[PDB]
Write a protein that binds this ligand. Sequence first.
Ligand SMILES: Nc1ncnc2c1ncn2[C@@H]1O[C@H](CSCC[C@H](N)C(=O)O)[C@@H](O)[C@H]1O
Ligand code: NA
Length: 239
Amino acid sequence: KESLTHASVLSAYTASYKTTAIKSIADNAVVLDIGYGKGNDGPRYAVRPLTVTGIDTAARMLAIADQNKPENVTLVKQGFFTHITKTSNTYTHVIAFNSLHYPLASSHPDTLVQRLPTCPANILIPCHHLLEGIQTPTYSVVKDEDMWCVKVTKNEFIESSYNYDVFVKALESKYHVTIGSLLDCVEKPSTRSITPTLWTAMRNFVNNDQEMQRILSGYITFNLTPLPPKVEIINDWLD
Ligand SMILES: Nc1ncnc2c1ncn2[C@@H]1O[C@H](CSCC[C@H](N)C(=O)O)[C@@H](O)[C@H]1O
Ligand code: NA
């Protein structure tokens, strides 16, 4: 133990994937961040040619996010389904980092996907069926009846189950999908507290810790590009 615990590596790798995704958003995009929360990705949006709408259901967290909100960011307090109905923005990129499993637990996965704007997207989602059993001093996922118990540091969150399989099958109806894991992250997070020496120390710990690789393998990433328009019947016409 020396600043190098399971929760520490997880947030750093999470920070790694957000750095790459936000950077890879096309220039001048109108972005929707579903679950903007307390504003961790503000500094990454602030240094970029992007118009961003951050939506959350928690006002207390959107209050922490306003205390240092970049001006290219607009904050709105409405969940995803209300906002998609009411908004006048046409979005060109969707971001959802550790957020979509909440709406997916109270909706049909095909309804969430068809309601998402038809635009490129990046999704980080925990797959609790790939995380159950992992018990480390700072990270633990355990089953509790129909609900999931997850402990980060000492935070004791309860999350509900969602249908990952149907979700992935619905994305395949709309998107070219490349699936991945946090374990596939190499790029150094933009977080300035993560020095080059510390990142190397984190990635070396991943190469030599089984528990860590399991935690990282259970945080599933989705790089989405919209399929061609239903006029894909022309290509099937080559059968
Ligand atoms: N249906 C919903 N619509 C929008 N935001 C939601 C939501 N359900 C939960 N959220 C928000 O999603 C967030 C996930 S945690 C914060 C995630 C943030 N993207 C980050 O990277 O730090 C929470 O703040 C939660 O309030
Ligand atoms: Na670019």
